[PDB]
Design an enzyme around this catalytic site. Sequence first.
Site, PDB file in Angstrom:
ATOM      1  N   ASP A  58      34.134  44.908  35.964  1.00 36.17           N
ATOM      2  CA  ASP A  58      35.271  44.172  36.570  1.00 36.17           C
ATOM      3  C   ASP A  58      35.099  43.876  38.041  1.00 36.17           C
ATOM      4  OD1 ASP A  58      35.878  46.619  37.704  1.00 36.17           O
ATOM      5  OD2 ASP A  58      37.518  47.069  36.254  1.00 36.17           O
ATOM      6  N   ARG A 109      37.209  41.757  42.739  1.00 37.10           N
ATOM      7  CA  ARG A 109      37.753  42.570  41.658  1.00 37.10           C
ATOM      8  C   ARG A 109      38.532  41.656  40.743  1.00 37.10           C
ATOM      9  NH1 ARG A 109      39.891  45.024  37.974  1.00 37.10           N
ATOM     10  NH2 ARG A 109      40.308  47.299  37.913  1.00 37.10           N
ATOM     11  N   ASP A 162      40.911  46.200  33.495  1.00 31.61           N
ATOM     12  CA  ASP A 162      40.221  47.443  33.858  1.00 31.61           C
ATOM     13  C   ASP A 162      39.126  47.689  32.843  1.00 31.61           C
ATOM     14  OD1 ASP A 162      39.844  49.743  35.494  1.00 31.61           O
ATOM     15  OD2 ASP A 162      41.078  50.948  34.092  1.00 31.61           O
ATOM     16  N   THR A 163      37.885  47.710  33.341  1.00 27.92           N
ATOM     17  CA  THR A 163      36.746  48.170  32.523  1.00 27.92           C
ATOM     18  C   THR A 163      36.455  49.640  32.782  1.00 27.92           C
ATOM     19  OG1 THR A 163      35.244  47.216  34.234  1.00 27.92           O
ATOM     20  CG2 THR A 163      35.645  45.921  32.364  1.00 27.92           C
ATOM     21  N   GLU A 167      34.395  52.826  34.016  1.00 20.29           N
ATOM     22  CA  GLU A 167      33.353  53.032  35.016  1.00 20.29           C
ATOM     23  C   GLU A 167      32.033  53.298  34.294  1.00 20.29           C
ATOM     24  OE1 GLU A 167      34.076  52.615  38.309  1.00 20.29           O
ATOM     25  OE2 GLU A 167      36.201  52.321  37.844  1.00 20.29           O
ATOM     26  N   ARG A 217      38.528  43.834  48.758  1.00 20.46           N
ATOM     27  CA  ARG A 217      38.012  43.041  47.629  1.00 20.46           C
ATOM     28  C   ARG A 217      38.859  41.821  47.377  1.00 20.46           C
ATOM     29  NH1 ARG A 217      37.396  47.744  43.090  1.00 20.46           N
ATOM     30  NH2 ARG A 217      39.661  47.555  43.444  1.00 20.46           N
TER      31      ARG A 217
HETATM   32  C1  LIG Z   1      42.941  44.935  40.008  1.00 21.89           C
HETATM   33  C2  LIG Z   1      43.710  45.468  41.213  1.00 21.89           C
HETATM   34  C3  LIG Z   1      43.343  46.673  41.725  1.00 21.89           C
HETATM   35  N1  LIG Z   1      43.965  47.134  42.860  1.00 21.89           N
HETATM   36  C4  LIG Z   1      43.733  48.538  43.380  1.00 21.89           C
HETATM   37  C5  LIG Z   1      44.606  49.550  42.598  1.00 21.89           C
HETATM   38  C6  LIG Z   1      43.704  50.785  42.459  1.00 21.89           C
HETATM   39  O1  LIG Z   1      43.917  51.635  43.619  1.00 21.89           O
HETATM   40  P1  LIG Z   1      43.243  53.111  43.650  1.00 21.89           P
HETATM   41  O2  LIG Z   1      41.832  52.928  44.136  1.00 21.89           O
HETATM   42  O3  LIG Z   1      44.084  53.844  44.717  1.00 21.89           O
HETATM   43  O4  LIG Z   1      43.313  53.745  42.265  1.00 21.89           O
HETATM   44  C7  LIG Z   1      42.271  50.192  42.489  1.00 21.89           C
HETATM   45  C8  LIG Z   1      41.685  50.189  41.067  1.00 21.89           C
HETATM   46  O5  LIG Z   1      40.414  49.479  41.160  1.00 21.89           O
HETATM   47  P2  LIG Z   1      39.206  49.968  40.307  1.00 21.89           P
HETATM   48  O6  LIG Z   1      39.596  49.906  38.845  1.00 21.89           O
HETATM   49  O7  LIG Z   1      38.122  48.913  40.695  1.00 21.89           O
HETATM   50  O8  LIG Z   1      38.851  51.454  40.698  1.00 21.89           O
HETATM   51  O9  LIG Z   1      42.375  48.870  43.041  1.00 21.89           O
HETATM   52  C9  LIG Z   1      44.919  46.415  43.471  1.00 21.89           C
HETATM   53  O10 LIG Z   1      45.512  46.861  44.475  1.00 21.89           O
HETATM   54  N2  LIG Z   1      45.273  45.181  43.030  1.00 21.89           N
HETATM   55  C10 LIG Z   1      44.690  44.701  41.899  1.00 21.89           C
HETATM   56  O11 LIG Z   1      45.082  43.615  41.443  1.00 21.89           O
HETATM   57 CA   LIG Z   2      37.407  49.801  36.689  1.00 21.37          CA
END
Ligand SMILES: Cc1cn([C@H]2C[C@H](OP(=O)(O)O)[C@@H](COP(=O)(O)O)O2)c(=O)[nH]c1=O
Ligand SMILES: [Ca+2]
Length: 129
Positions: free
Chosen positions: A15, A29, A34-35, A37, A75
């Site tokens: 993702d 991103r 959500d994929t 890890e 991102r």
């Molecule tokens: C997809 C997405 C993720 N995020 C944030 C929430 C999550 O915060 P936390 O890092 O505090 O868990 C993180 C999850 O991304 P990843 O799934 O790439 O780890 O990215 C956003 O803020 N907005 C979004 O639209």
């Molecule tokens: Ca992920």
Amino acid sequence: LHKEPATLIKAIDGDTVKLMYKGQPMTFRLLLVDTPEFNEKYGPEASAFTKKMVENAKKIEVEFDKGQRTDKYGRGLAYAYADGKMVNEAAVRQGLAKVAYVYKGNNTHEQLLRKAEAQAKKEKLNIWS
Ligand SMILES: Cc1cn([C@H]2C[C@H](OP(=O)(O)O)[C@@H](COP(=O)(O)O)O2)c(=O)[nH]c1=O
Ligand SMILES: [Ca+2]
């Protein structure tokens, strides 16, 4: 929403992908998904699926939604297209991503992606097997 040009710099995981957008390198991103890890079950398969889709594309595009265009880590948040086919949807449709992180006002394609998830689940694909 509007599609805009970008070019692949490097695949990262299921993702996230590094793209050049308006001439600058950015990690994107993918919205609404959500994929797993890489270290988790189906993680390597999700990474390989997104890598193949973006590396084989002649044309990558990004489409921002109506709300935040960047997250707290800097991102880009977008829908990504490979030769017109949405990556976010395609990963959900193959059971390699779940619909997730649905924040109000960056959720234009939510229903499209929930329909793809329902199909992947009915087929018992990957994550849903
Ligand atoms: C997809 C997405 C993720 N995020 C944030 C929430 C999550 O915060 P936390 O890092 O505090 O868990 C993180 C999850 O991304 P990843 O799934 O790439 O780890 O990215 C956003 O803020 N907005 C979004 O639209
Ligand atoms: Ca992920």
